[PDB]
Amino acid sequence: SIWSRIVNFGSGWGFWVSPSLFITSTHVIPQSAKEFFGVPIKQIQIHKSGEFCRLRFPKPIRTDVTGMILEEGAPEGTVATLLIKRPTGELMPLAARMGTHATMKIQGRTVGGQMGMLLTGLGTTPGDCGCPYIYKRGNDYVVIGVHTAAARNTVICATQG
């Protein structure tokens, strides 16, 4: 049911944080779309902070979901989960130890986010960007960013500005 918040989007995926708030990685946005989820793009408040993209819709879209806590990365050392969906239908949760917060240049673009190391040492692939990183803090799920890059165990979670 957390999985139902992860939806194919452009060349990756994105995640419904609340009925009106959808997050994704900026580089996967389909650049020739006129609307997202049936809403003309110019009616959506689309904020890009490097590779972290927030789409705020003018009316609720996913009214079946509750609003989830969204934070800017996690404490260093947190074992988060990257919730990968694949176009075969698989739901592949991967633990990742979160590390340093930084602003980097990746393929010439500025990317604010947090590094992680997958605990598989079973990894990420083209098509996976925009999938969410989450962790559990007490009784609360916390979403901390979106998948943006990985070494060909290092992954990069883009985080809000």
Add this chain to the structure above:
Amino acid sequence: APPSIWSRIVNFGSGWGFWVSPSLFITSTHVIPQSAKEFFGVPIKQIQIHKSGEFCRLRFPKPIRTDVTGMILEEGAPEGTVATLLIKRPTGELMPLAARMGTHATMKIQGRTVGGQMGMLLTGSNAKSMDLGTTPGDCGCPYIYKRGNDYVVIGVHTAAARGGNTVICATQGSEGEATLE
């Protein structure tokens, strides 16, 4: 894992099992339909039923699933190997759960002697707190890893701790009540 692996996992009794080859099916002993007269259309007395504790292997006298190629079956994996537990749920989900395979040992579970290999799920900090682990109904799903170009199946899901990441993979040759055929 490729779809040709997933299609080998089918419901069986109160859990699941896995077609290793067209004639060879593995599952967890405790999920098997009790008092069944046939499996997959074959009378029980015509099947070679091997049990090693909670690992159960059914060998059929002719090919059943002629669409599958034969896969290497080994008795667990080396300690430290990262495998995938391929979970299917009755709600339709396909959930590959990464697991680091640990020590081979023999457990006593619900009064039964259950040999196998302990594993640690690598899906989150605490798989159970996050609903990213295993649950009743998941037994018999396979643990599989890739060694070079070859997939290797190492056993079947049999048990897991009520919290945290520990899972138990029952293996061929493991300790427990045994039958040769």
